[PDB]
Structures are given as C-alpha cells and as structure tokens.
Amino acid sequence: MVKVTYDIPTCEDYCALRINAGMSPKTREAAEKGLPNALFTVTLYDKDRLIGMGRVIGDGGTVFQIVDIAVLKSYQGQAYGSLIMEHIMKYIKNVSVESVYVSLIADYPADKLYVKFGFMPTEPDSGGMYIKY
C-alpha cells in the first residue's frame, strides 16, 4: 500500500533510487544543490521506504522538462511509474497554456510509459544532445 507524497526525498534516498532504477549516478553534492529547486516533486513511499519519484523543471509558461522518473526495480511494471506521471501531468496541466512545450529524455525501455501519456519522440526532426560534468 504505497503512499503518494509531494515531499522532497533525502539526498541518500534520491541517489540510491537512481542507481536502483539503472539511471546515471548523481553525487550527494549535486543532490544537495538540486533537490530543493524543482518546480514540482512527487515521491512514493512504501511505509518509510522511497520506492519511486518524479520531478519537473521549467519556466512555468513556455517550457518544462520532466526529470528523474525512477522506480525501484522490484516495483517496476506494476503501475507506479503511471502513478508518478499522473501527478506530474496534473501539475503541468494546471500551469500549461497554448504553445507550452514539455519534453523529457527517455532511455529506450521507458518509451512505453511515456507513450501512455501522449509523449512522442522528437526524432527524426530533432534529437537529444547532452553533456555530463
């Protein structure tokens, strides 16, 4: 019986959850700097354990990016990613207007989840590019 909260997770839990979800690691320093500064955060807990999260960055009008959609491996494929996204999309729908753009960077196995929410690839017209420090 998982609980939905809008609480920001601890740095330790955030970092560990990314690893558990097979995402690129983040340092505690990066987490300390970033966690307080999302537009919106959703965290899922099973008792006191963080089992999933999602975050949004953006400018509140013209552009948003959904980031850090992460679910523990043992909890995957059971609807928790959709629970996270449902709340994220509720947030974005309350702020978005005509011409607002929302995007994300999806690892290929994640495409299925995001497709449920109406996302489509930017390719072939445009592609993600990145750097890591």
Place this chain on the structure above:
Amino acid sequence: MVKVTYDIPTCEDYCALRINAGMSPKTREAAEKGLPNALFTVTLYDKDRLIGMGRVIGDGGTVFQIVDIAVLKSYQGQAYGSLIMEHIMKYIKNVSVESVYVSLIADYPADKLYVKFGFMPTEPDSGGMYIKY
C-alpha cells in the same frame, strides 16, 4: 559590435525573435508566464534591435536544459549562436558539479553548433520525447 545583456527580454522581443529565427511561435500569454522564470537568459542586441537569445532551465545542481537558442535568420551563420552558447556555458560552469547533466533538443544543422561546446547525441540509447499544447 553587439551588446550582451543578461536582462529579462520583453514579451514582444521574445516572441518576435522566435518567429524571425524560423522557430514555432509562443503565445504572448506563455511568454508572460515563462520569461521571468529561467535560471539564466542571455540576449544580444545590434544597436537597439534584439538579434539573439538563449535560456537555461534547471534545478541548480543535478540537471539543466538549454532552451530557446534563437538567432535572427538574417544574423545566422556568423558566430552569434556561438556567442550565446559561450555565455550559457559560462553560467553552467559556475553552478555545475561532478555528475551535473545538461541536455538540449537539436534539429539538423543546429546540432553542428552544440557539438562545438562538447554536446553529444543521446541517441540511440536515449531519446527526446515531447508534448506540445
């Protein structure tokens, strides 16, 4: 020589620059809501005309997205995109730490600009996905 500014653009100048850079328009409503809320904005002016801009959204530690890289069609192909990116990369360098991720969405020829600054494709393992309202 162009004047470089980190000031908030006007809604008119922003919307006008998007259109005249050959990008999809933003409504003035979206611009009004979005413009104050980027982490960083650089604007280039030729005398009293806005000719270029770039913006950054993010959480200040873990993730940033570079957005709205817009240079007038009539000013393209001569280093102004690079000038914008130099100022953006300066901003990110002063806030980024080990593990910070920065991404963007680029079409073709545009990818040639970002490659100069060390950006590489997310594809094939990861891809941009979007919704537009």
